[PDB]
Design a protein around this nucleic acid. Structure first.
Ligand SMILES: O=c1[nH]c(=S)[nH]c2[nH]c(=S)[nH]c12
Length: 266
DNA sequence: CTCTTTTTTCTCG
DNA sequence: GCGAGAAACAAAGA
DNA sequence: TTTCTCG
């Protein structure tokens, strides 16, 4: 999941589990609780969920007054809300049980993580990861963005994916963003001129805010509609510009990369 | 049998 | 620094 | 790394 899907999950969770008391926590895969399942079980049991926030692709459960559970879904993490008597499915790893239902975390590839953090350690946690600004007009300052692009020789697609220029882009939306900004994924960022950087800046914000509006692309968050709006991701061999160009797929810095060669020249 | 495909972090030259 | 490659893991799809 | 797929 990328920022839009996580934000969709956040919103659904906010509606359903805020105000609920955690009755018990169970794990068939405790190793995904990086700070220690035992400790997490002991601190959070009996606590009431006060809210859910998000930073980039990270979910943040606000539980009791002094704890935060930071959850990352990585590649295939999924939450679902189920009755207390729901059967176990094969890749369920964790469950937070309430009085009248449970929240189950599943992850086929086991990449997803949980970390229990002190409330005043949350801001330092994201500082250490060097996570960039949220993709909004208010937080995503184009001037700093521009200064960083100009000082670097990195290719624009893997640089954007670093989460440091701006938070929340993953493989789908960076491909959609570069298509929309008419920029080649392998463009060296110090070659970008001012007007391209401006278009790229706005496009990053516009695409992500749109995806959020449509509930993300495709359990919680499984009713998204952004996938219908995708212009290049996963559409190899299909048309992009009303002239005849087909979408090409190449490998860039280890990632499958979809682009329209005629519209996205260097 | 083999290989490649689908977020974050680490190695290493 | 930097980037190429791989690690963590499961299930495809060839 | 493990298992499936027409296997
Ligand atoms: O956190 C990341 N760091 C790097 S270097 N690349 C990358 N690609 C995605 S997606 N996330 C990240």
């Amino acid at each position: 999941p990328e920022l839009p899907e996580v934000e969709t999950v956040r919103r659904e969770l906010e509606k359903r589990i805020v105000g609920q008391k955690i009755i018990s926590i169970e794990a068939t895969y405790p190793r995904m609780v990086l700070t220690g399942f035992e400790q997490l079980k002991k601190e959070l049991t009996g606590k009431t969920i006060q809210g859910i926030s998000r930073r980039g692709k990270y979910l943040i459960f606000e539980i009791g007054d002094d704890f935060r559970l930071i959850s990352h879904l990585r590649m295939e993490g999924k939450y679902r809300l189920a009755t207390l008597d729901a059967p176990r499915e094969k890749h369920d790893h964790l469950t937070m049980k309430f009085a009248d239902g449970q929240l189950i975390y599943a992850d086929v590839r086991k990449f997803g993580t949980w970390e229990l953090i002190s409330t005043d350690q949350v801001l330092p946690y994201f500082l250490k990861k060097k996570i960039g600004p949220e993709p909004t007009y208010e937080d995503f300052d184009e001037k700093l963005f521009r200064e960083k692009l100009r000082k670097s020789t990195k290719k624009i697609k893997p640089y954007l994916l670093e989460q440091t220029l701006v938070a929340g882009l993953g493989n789908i939306y960076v491909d959609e963003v570069l298509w929309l900004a008419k920029i080649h994924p392998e463009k060296e960022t110090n070659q970008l001129i001012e007007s391209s950087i401006h278009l790229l800046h706005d496009s990053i914000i516009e695409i992500l805010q749109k995806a959020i509006k449509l509930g993300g692309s495709s359990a919680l968050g499984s009713t998204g509609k952004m996938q219908n709006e995708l212009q290049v991701y996963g559409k190899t061999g299909e048309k992009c510009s009303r002239c005849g160009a087909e979408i090409q797929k190449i490998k860039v810095a280890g990632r499958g990369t979809h682009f329209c060669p005629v519209c996205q020249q260097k």
